Amino acid sequence: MSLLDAHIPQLVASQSAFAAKAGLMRHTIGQAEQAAMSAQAFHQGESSAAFQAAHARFVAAAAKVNTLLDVAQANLGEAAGTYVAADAAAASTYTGF
């Protein structure tokens, strides 16, 4: 009464869905950032302080998502096997009162 292949998965783990997800994240930002460009066609120049701050705020946070994506795969192992020895200042951060 042995059940061989009845309700069992297949290529669900070996394929590693985690990795596919990690890469899907950057896709949302990469494509999203492009949209802000098309709209920036307003006058098309260079000067843009108000927008700069907002643009820097995004990249500043991305460091948290990216850094977390590496540790996740590194800690999970099966998730993925990669590294990014680039370092940065955001990795340190700081807090006051």
Binding site: A32, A54, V65
Partner: protein, 97 residues
């Protein structure tokens, strides 16, 4: 106050599409990675850097600020009605100049 400069009608000020969605898209995107890793918690080490508990909170705290970073530029969306004095939310609340 700069309304008598060159702001006849709300041309740029206000909305112009669906930007709020682009940002929120990131939040939902990260949720997938947060729930995925939660299934491979037993696989997590913890003696490498970030822990399962720290990663969970950190991730959410990251995606949260990561999204707002995009809405920051779209903050002008509500700035439209701001022109009106009846409301006065950021004006009467402001204290610069």
């Amino acid at each position: 106050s700069m309304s008598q400069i060159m702001y006849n009608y709300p041309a740029m000020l206000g909305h112009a599409g669906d930007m709020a969605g682009y940002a929120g898209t990131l939040q939902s995107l990260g949720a997938e990675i947060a729930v995925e890793q939660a299934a491979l918690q037993s696989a997590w080490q913890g003696d490498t850097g970030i822990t399962y508990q720290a990663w969970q909170a950190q991730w959410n705290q990251a995606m949260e600020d990561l999204v707002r970073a995009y809405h920051a530029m779209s903050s002008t969306h509500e700035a439209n009605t701001m022109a009106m004095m009846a409301r006065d939310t950021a004006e009467a609340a402001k204290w610069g100049g």
